[PDB]
Structures are given as structure tokens and as C-alpha cells.
């Protein structure tokens, strides 16, 4: 209940928000790499 404890918990929640963002970026890599792979495997041979 102390102000120090509250600031501590606030930072903890901020860090969890950053961890969620970190997970979202990891999946963004997957999304972009999936687009890359489809183009290279299914489209590029046609041209």
C-alpha cells in the first residue's frame, strides 16, 4: 500500500505490456516470413 510498492507494481505491469508487444513482434516475423515463402515457392517459379 506504500507509494514505493505502488510504483513497483506499476512498473511490473508496464513490463508485462512490453512482453506482450515482444510476443506480437515474434508473430509478425512469422506472418512476414509466410508471405515471403509463398511468393518464393508458389509464384516465383511461374515467372
Amino acid at each position: 500500500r506504500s507509494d514505493i510498492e505502488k510504483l513497483k507494481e506499476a512498473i511490473r505491469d508496464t513490463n508485462k505490456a512490453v512482453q506482450s508487444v515482444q510476443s506480437s513482434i515474434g508473430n509478425l516475423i512469422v506472418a512476414i516470413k509466410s508471405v515471403q515463402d509463398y511468393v518464393n515457392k508458389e509464384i516465383v517459379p511461374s515467372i
Binding site: 505490456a17 508487444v21 506480437s24
Partner: protein, 33 residues
């Protein structure tokens, strides 16, 4: 879909919503100071 990235994009949106709520909880704590 040709290219189907629905699963991964849906997971990204879901993780962003969780991120937004953690920031909401953080500001809510700072408001009690």
C-alpha cells in the same frame, strides 16, 4: 486464402489487446498515488 495468415494476425491483435490492458492497469495504479 493463396496466402492465409489469419491465425497469426489474429494472435497478434489478441496480444496487442493484452498489452493495452497491462498499460491500463499500470496507469490505474499510478492514479492511486
Amino acid at each position: 486464402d493463396x496466402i492465409d495468415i489469419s491465425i497469426v494476425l489474429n494472435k497478434i491483435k489478441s496480444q496487442l489487446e493484452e498489452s493495452k490492458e497491462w498499460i491500463r492497469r499500470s496507469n490505474k495504479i499510478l492514479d492511486s498515488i
